[model samples]
Target: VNSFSGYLKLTDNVYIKNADIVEEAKKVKPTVVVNAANVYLKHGGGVAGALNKATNNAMQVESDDYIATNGPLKVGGSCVLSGHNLAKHCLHVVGPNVNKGEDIQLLKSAYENFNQHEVLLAPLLSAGIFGADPIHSLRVCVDTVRTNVYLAVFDKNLYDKLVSSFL
Candidate 1:
């Protein structure tokens, strides 16, 4: 099996937006790519769209070897537990509303749990799904999982402390 290996800081500086992360991932040409629902180009797209776009891009970029997880599988559209095989498997985790005060706990828990198996985690915010609150999700993830966490934001100063704490 052929695999692409490298490092990319999914943030504003490196990635213009969450959608860009998917685009960048295509560039790396990874056999197994994993990211969160919140990674998106804008704060308003929502989790469902992000998942669709990520999966679509993966298929477009590397067809037949794309893998992704997490987000609202039943939100923007129906969750396909099985089908066209858009990816090897799509893991969907519906999260609480941005105002429910459970964003942090929900995201952190998801990360800690999923991190064990995935190589990289890129969480995104869907405007229609998670109310487009990327910062909230980022905080929850940073607070919960300390290792193998990558912030899709461009500002290094924003996550510098959080990154250090994890170390």
Candidate 2:
């Protein structure tokens, strides 16, 4: 594996990074971190699952309460959780399912729901379990934020692909 850790600016305030999400979370100290979740807020897989485990499942517990109050989140809808080991806040957004044609749109919508903040951390939505192409997912995220977006990535090839595309 070709490991790398750095940031590539996509726009004035937007950047794509190659690093561990949890480690980047500490370094950037973002006010909010977005996690891709299902309508039920189950963080049992993908980036959400990793984050859930990292935070001792605090995100899941919070999301459960959120769903209990507001009902299951609609596609593109979201709820917030107080970050346990991540950020000051965690934005759990409902993204598309695997192979869903609406993945791009739903991922873009998820980013649109982010609260205004100086710094926000996000993953490549729908790229893992949802089966969205990582490159396309990166593009959608960039298109949505336009500014002040930080994407954490762990895959070396994906990072290289993003660097090539952005350049």
Candidate 3:
């Protein structure tokens, strides 16, 4: 199971917001990082597959118009999806279906962090494993960091909570 007892910390002051995960990682410099409880795997080919096809096409496209219209592949891997500049290295996965009852506390915690602005940077909840929700993504984006943010997902509940919090 994924446990945050050591990896993540919540402050007594509810108002404090924005923390850099990368920087935190640097500070802690743990040999191994694991978010055990939650994760999602997408299979059978869809938009991600289409993205792959478009990416392949773009590779061979000599026309500038094609290049402009079709962007580069953001990620490459089986049972995974990714996006953005770091998409090459990061593997994003869709979480499982969320349960309102089992996940309320987690959702509440996510909201707390989101409202407090403690989690720096808004991830692309509009795309990739986070699902496509422009309005919700915008809310989290606006509320979270001033600049430069990355989201790390570990499970379905976390992902849903995160997406819903902003929405």
Candidate 4:
């Protein structure tokens, strides 16, 4: 993993960080760990995939039920599931698959659904399989949450970029 350990203040309470998502999740023991997913709520790739495996696929089961009842989750839509191996809860948000610039609003909308918790753990929104620019995605996540946002990043290049540019 990257040796980076620091955070950028996006606001008084919000922050962008370079760290392992799972490690931070274990440390903070947050009320919920937000899983960025598609409309299908498929926890089969990227952060969602890892988290699914970590939670013993419990998140996937719940998310599948949610979608089955409510239909496909649109951008900005969200659902909450019990966390088996991480937090007490897992909040799944549907993020857009578009590029970085076009997905900011959608990212913002996805994050808005997570107001129930005080400390929320999340990955760099859409920065993984969704193909968003890490920096831009982090900025949008910071902007959207504005409080108690803990962004966990593992990319060394992204960590370097954020450190050199901000910290």
TM-scores of all predicted structures: 0.45, 0.86, 0.26, 0.83
- State the RMSD for candidate 1: 8.7
Better of 1 and 4 by lDDT: 4
Task: Answer with 2 or 4, whichever has the higher TM-score.
Answer: 2
1-167, model 3: which lDDT tens digit per residue? Answer: 22112322212221112333333333433222111112222222333333334344331232233235553322211121222221222223222213312332232223233333222322333233324343444343445424223343324454555545542
The CA lDDT of each predicted structure is 0.38, 0.75, 0.30, 0.73
Q: Give the local distance difference test score of model 4.
A: 0.73
Q: Judge candidate 2 at residue 42 and give its lDDT.
A: 82
As a whole number from 0 to 100, the lDDT of residue 61 in candidate 2 is: 88
**For candidate 1, what is the TM-score?**
0.45
Residue 88, model 4, lDDT? 83
Q: TM-score ranking from best to worst?
A: 2, 4, 1, 3
Total clashes in model 3, counting residue pairs 3 or more apart in sequence or in different chains: 9
RMSD of 4: 4.2
By lDDT, who's the top model here?
A: 2
| All candidates: CA RMSD (Å) | 8.7, 4.2, 14.7, 4.2
lDDT rank, highest first?
Answer: 2, 4, 1, 3
Task: Tell me how far the alpha carbon of residue 105 in candidate 4 is from the true structure, in angstroms, after superposition.
Answer: 2.9
